[PDB]
Amino acid sequence: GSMKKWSDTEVFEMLKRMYARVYGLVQGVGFRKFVQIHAIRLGIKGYAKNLPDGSVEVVAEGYEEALSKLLERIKQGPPAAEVEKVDYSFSEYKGEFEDFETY
Structure with missing residues (x-):
C-alpha cells in the first residue's frame, strides 16, 4: 500500500x-x-x-470545480433552440460582474 x-x-x-x-x-x-x-x-x-x-454573447465567470460543472452542463444539455455554432472562448477576468443577469 501507500505511505505518502x-x-x-x-x-x-x-x-x-x-x-x-x-x-x-x-x-x-x-x-x-x-x-x-x-x-x-x-x-x-x-x-x-x-x-x-442570433449571436448572443455571455460573459459567465467561474472557478474550477464550479467552472467544469457550468461548462459540462451547457454542451451536454443544449438549449431548446437551433444552436448553430456555440464557439466559446476561455479567457481571463478583467473584473467581476455584479452577480449574473440576462438581457
Whole structure:
C-alpha cells in the first residue's frame, strides 16, 4: 500500500471569465435562462447579453470545480433552440460582474 499522501483542488479565491459566444436561433427561448439556473446554482457571476440578432454573447465567470460543472452542463444539455455554432472562448477576468443577469 501507500505511505505518502497529498490533497489538492478546493474552492478558495478568484475565478476566470469564460466568454461564451452562442450562435443560432437561441433568441426568444429560455437559453440564457437555462444558463442562469445552473450559473446561479453554482455561484457564477457575469451577464447574458442576448442582443436579438442570433449571436448572443455571455460573459459567465467561474472557478474550477464550479467552472467544469457550468461548462459540462451547457454542451451536454443544449438549449431548446437551433444552436448553430456555440464557439466559446476561455479567457481571463478583467473584473467581476455584479452577480449574473440576462438581457
